[PDB]
Amino acid sequence: MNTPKEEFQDWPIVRIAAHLPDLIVYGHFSPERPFMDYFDGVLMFVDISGFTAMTEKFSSAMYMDRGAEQLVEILNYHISAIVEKVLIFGGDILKFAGDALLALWRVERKQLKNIITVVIKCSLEIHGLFLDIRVKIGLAAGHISMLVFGDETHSHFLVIGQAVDDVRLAQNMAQMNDVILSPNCWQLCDRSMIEIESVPDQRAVKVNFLKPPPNFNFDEFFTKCTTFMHYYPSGEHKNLLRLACTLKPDPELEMSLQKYVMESILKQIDNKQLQGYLSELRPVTIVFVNLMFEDQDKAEEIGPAIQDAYMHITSVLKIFQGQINKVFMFDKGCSFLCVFGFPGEKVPDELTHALECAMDIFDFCSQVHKIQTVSIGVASGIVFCGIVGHTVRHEYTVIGQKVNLAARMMMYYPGIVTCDSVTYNGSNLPAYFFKELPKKVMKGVADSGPLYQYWGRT
Template identity: 45%
Template structure:
């Protein structure tokens, strides 16, 4: 058992128990309720029973998570979070399990526990649970941590009739508890302050009031605060506990000495094991199958959280609620799976059912994660409301940021969960902006979607949220084209392209051949996110412009894939200069000038939708079918490109070409046969395979005039060169080189983020280079006149004291394997002079 005090033990869980079986490892993720004889059959999805519920909530953990998420070493920060919470939660759970409680669910840093008994045993069981609660609060009500934050506990208790509901499909199963007692325990916990034990009104009426001292909170029939409980005798406690245990252990192995939870000793049973695995997340199953320790599941990880609430009508029976939850659960899974999202938790309190969905868990990271989450939110909202199942409203909150992902609980009973400030914010958005899909500013910015797809929402005061920032309503991706998007990032004079000499030479070679022969050529680059593909594109565009050629460049996003002819329209708009036009009339004038002689004026109205203009509808176009209009638009595309290449050598760049819509691919394949163009396209990995591209795109990639190049990771020399440039130094130590290569894998973006993180946390310190010194000074030179100081996050360092110039920045600290590495970094003379001035 733990006790109040500082958390100093390095590991939260003892090594795996010798009693734990292979099936027990799986059973540790589910409650005993799922193992009982009357519920473990797949055909049985609803069961009614009586019991006592306890909801214990740890306050202060979100602040702890945020503090550790600022750590320079996220892996170590995640381990600190897991150890601190699980040491505390483990002590609490040991008490609950020892008193016969069945741990149903973990809701982040809270836990819901059940004592399932007959209705006639409720009175005595409430007394048992009260004794357990008082003991927990006395021993573990407050816990200090090593970082100066306190963890505190508050408890709510209810009792009565409830229903156990299993939902899901053939791949995934989830369960929840429904009933008045569930809503009561939630409300009781909400009324509690740190250190309190609150009884619901119904629970207060059931219990033996002569043995309980309580204080009314809101009148005679409302919840009460427990101030004292008459202690049970040992024989009385054992008698009540044995009655509880008989129901709980009906399908488990008999109680064994030294085994806190018999379920972990279950003998291998293939059918039961297969059924239980459906209740476990894919992330957990992979770790279990690989035999990896539970600690490996804990990390501080950037994800996108999506909280969904289904609000039911006031007068709706349980049958309709059960059916609505089942249908909604299946719908959500079908919507989330293609986007690599998954349901992490499902709970029901009061009159609403909530689902916590997460995008970006291990093995599930995808590009444009926030777009996937927002679109999934809209689809979920529409799909759930379309079903006639008494759902009055669907509210969704979406947030993006770093949260704790990992296993929470005790060695014999735990769950994989996500928690942190961003998870809490998603829940608050869901509650305070009902009936809409709302999102935080981080999700809005990360999506890179046009502002017209969002609407700013009014401010709302949210419990536990000091500054939520701007909140937006997501309206959904429109099929209408949006002008003013697709402009690629401009080349930065301060960020030279490094390590891509082969690609630059290849571009110049093919460009020279194109200029000489005027034959179509396609240069396709495939590069991972962060590999510098967009940087390469901007450099190639500059080379083309420097050679006196016209450059037409666009950058696509995922929304373009969902809009007909989107890529074609963007290329046309850029080629004709429509992006710079601020009004409809200005665009019409440009179109009339550029298209004069290329098409009849009666056909101008075909351009109204793609270019947001208002040419009068002609009789000729009004009689055209959809297929005829498509042919005519392709003809316009071809004529504009033909005129463009005839007037000058024009180079076309399409970044993120995996988002070209099928109709644009088809149009491009037709144009390439007749118009000699030089086209440079960029793909993300996995999108160039034949199974992922439409036929027209696959045909283009396989053309003889297509050169396909895979961007490789940067070589060590280029990584060092980049580090020197980004830091403004002339050299870096070998330890930093090794650190960057091991952590960045040669990906430029990762290298930038690592360096940015080191600088942001004051762990990069610079030593000025004296003329007589070599590029990398010797470590011994730092210890001439020295004085110890504390730097950054508690790392001790020494440097020579003297003039201000000598204190400019001295050492580099890297925190790897929990051992700081110290070396010198020489600062570029010009940078040093600017800093001093």
Template identity: 35%
Template sequence: MSLLLIEKDAEDCWCQYVIWAKNPYWAPDLDENLISDEQHSTTASSGARQNAGLLEAALLSEKVYLYTINDCVYSNVQAEIFATLLPSELINQYPLEGKTRTHFVGILLFGDVSGFTALCEKYFAEGGKGGTYKLTATLNSYIGAMVDVIYSYGGDIIKFSGDAFLAVWKVKRNDYIVEVIHRAIVCAMYIQHSLGSFETDANVLLRVKLAISAGNVIFSSIGEETSKYYVIYGKAVDEVKEAQDTCVSGDVVLAPSAWGHCSHVNYLYTHKDEIHIKILRIIYNPWQTNRKLFNLPPKQIVDLEKKYRYQIQRFKQVESFTDLNSAKFETVRPEVRTAAQRQLGPFLRPYLIPPVVAQVDAEQPLDYLTEMRLVTTVFINVILDKKGSVETIIERVDEVYTQIWQVVQKQMGVVNKVCMFDKDIMFLVIFGLRGAHHEYNAMRSLKCAYKIRSIISQLPHVKGIACGVTVGMTYCGVVGHPLRQEYTVIGAPVNKAARLMMYFPNKVTCDQQTYFNSGLSPIYFTEQEQKVLKGIGKVAGIYEYSEGKRGGGNVTIYQLPPLLGRDTELQTFQRVLDGYEGYPCGVLYCGDKGVGKTRLLEEFMIMCVNKPLRIILITLQTNHSTILYYTIQQIFKFMLNFASDEDIKSRTGKIISLLAGTEYVKYVFLLTHVLNLDVNDAPPELFSRSSQEVMKLKNKTLHKLIQLVWVLS
């Protein structure tokens, strides 16, 4: 008995064939359910999972993306829910078709909260004791309270980014910039006064640091009609990030662009460095003539569930609420009602990720999306050439976003966040969210990250790109204020991916868990030096993933690494070996380059140790497809032990000697082209036979030769 392993390397597809036969007269008919494309399931033995993968892809792509604006009809409540997930600046833009862009003077407030990762780990450790619910309640009460303060002081939350947020105060035509800046400072001081140090019931301390800048900014839409995002950019954005970098928890720091417009006598302050100012206390309101001492109100955290109970109830019972003009709907954020009055639901839809859109389409509360979930996180940092106008830079960001989205959506991933700071544009891509789970998310994310890096690095205005990939349990859900919330992912794996992205420039790097979960061969990975990552510590087991260095990896391996996530394939092959009734004698395993087919064949060979089998391994290259009968020639070459330099006459003599004594020896001529033999004389009787009869004789001769070779081997 023999085991035949064939590996085919093509430009667009890599295939390995595993053909097992105990009966030399059996011609394998491969069941189509055993054939699976990696893009759908990467599983050779389960047609059911292939269909499930296709269903997931349909739910994510066709159901969510293929609706046109004219096909979508949303109720008032659904439009309002969409509006709670987007900034007021976007909702107020008109028209919303195409790529809108607005220029204005803005006061930016950037906040960074510390303690969220520790809080997630604390609640996650509680397992089934309501940890997810407690975490949601804590996040909403803390972040929601800050959001409520910001809107109460006239600001607008542009975006949440995990444990950070960016708010803006728009300076309107009749406003004095000094008053708007002061309003932002009062808001920031109030947040520090009431929420600057917040101890949770899990004994984890949450703290926040705040930075303020001022200047001209542009708010712009980016992306395509089916998938859009929004960015805000200008010199003030870079300055607020620089100011935030000088902060420690509890600080309110002003950039020079903001401090230059302030009356210094109104504040008690100190210098953080040569250009940044830390506000210690507000002494006077600048527009007060009697110069009264300014005191903040007593510390308090607003009860959002009580204050906004009508809106919360309305959004949780989507179908039963239809009264748009209720007097109870008084809010600090009137844009939510505006979205319904202007029927903006179809226009806001492309700005939201598929899991959220699907939930709203199903008329289900967004609370149901909250969960601890195993996801794969890809952080991408793109360094652009910032020469040119702000409009030019935003156009470049638009191009990069579109390219990334086109790659990600084909692999069932989601672009969750886009952030612009200084020279960097950061993208947060998530694989494995609800409705888009796949068995091989780790493998898909690595291949996706490598493809993105290959495409983006070719753009003329891109100076560098780095990707960090991690796998782990993270908090996934909609958090924030009842009237301004966002879908976010928080957890140690997310932070780790961000650190890998920053510490290993111009590479696709991953942690050890991603390396093992990917199921990819070690030849695609190169172990990196240990580094101390900020907020994490010294980390070992960091690998660079590269498809261009196959065979060049230097991973230290003392034995073959464990094969993870291939239980179905191994069980199927074992049943084939054991001769289970109903199992075929052949297996076809298909997939893209680098998905782990070579490693799977290695495991198959290990399973055949100490069995009465002869293993034949054949590797096929793309150019072999132009050579007729190349594969079968290679099979006979190995089974008959032909030398690599054996001439054609010697091979012909061996084939004839095998068939000697049989009635088929005179028909060796028919195998001349099939086995590359040197037989020039055809039997005279062939000239009187029809082409169909000649073909039957050819097949019978080949089957007889296979039988004899099988016995010999």
């Protein structure tokens, strides 16, 4: 009696789960919104510098209109290698944002010290792998909260707390090629093994190298650590990068998971649209919304408010034809990266709509109870839109100088709605709806032409 080859089945649930971390795939929590969970772990925030520049170069004529295709190919080739290291070292990739990603090692408190060693080693091997591109890595460790928010058909999650703020601070300090530990990470780690240098004006520290003691064997140490890793592929599945590759059809589970994924990606998963379609360099408008709270580390304070804001944001975006691409803690608060002009959401009046949408969101969110300040940055231009990451773990994202510009506007001009000149000039709105603003020198930004506040009708 034969025992024939059992071919890999790439069921739709498996393709869906590629777009999500184990934190959600195997999370099985309440459908109530908001939902909050608390745990500890080590976070790794990995940034590839230079793709933003590259994006602008891939619109040039030398790319012969295959710029999007070339950009995603060279990006994924690099990012995939990083994704594999994170996964082999036992991490869960939580989210991709442009050419960066955030990974988590969730463990019990007693195991943070040893897991920190594992992550540092991971980081050094990644810093290893890496012709104009640098890798910067920030690490943090401690208490983490998760929030899930959304409505009956859409779900989103985010992580919150001091470790989340710390990992992003650590990463902003990294010079090209550094691995930086948060103060708390340094404080919890196995200092007898990890050799650091101080960072000026900073309690965070830079990793120089591992200094293992005499009888230390990393493979044996790693194996002990896998005891604590719930989803590490093992035994018969030790040849797989993710346990999620073995997920089996389950309509309840798939209904729950699909709510995290955008409709155009589900179309592609369901072989109702060609893959090529989602890799594009297209003119869009970014609307980058920031909500600042009294205490951005206290999930049960901020969770209700994010949900409240999300309910209004989503209904307004539906009307003005925009979409939430990503949400994360960023700029002392919760940020929504929204996009006008994604697959199948073209219009004329896109610019006007992005501006009217932004004002509406600003007025509403300004009044929701624990929101201290709202800031919104609007910028328009050619940006890369596509699926970034590894075959087994990837997400739809946007990369482009205008994406960064909108984020920087929202941070340097708090408490108002701002726009760039392309949006100002392009919009059908009268000039006295706007105010020309003082030019601020902005981190990471060369020369935006004039910037404007969208004052609205008075």
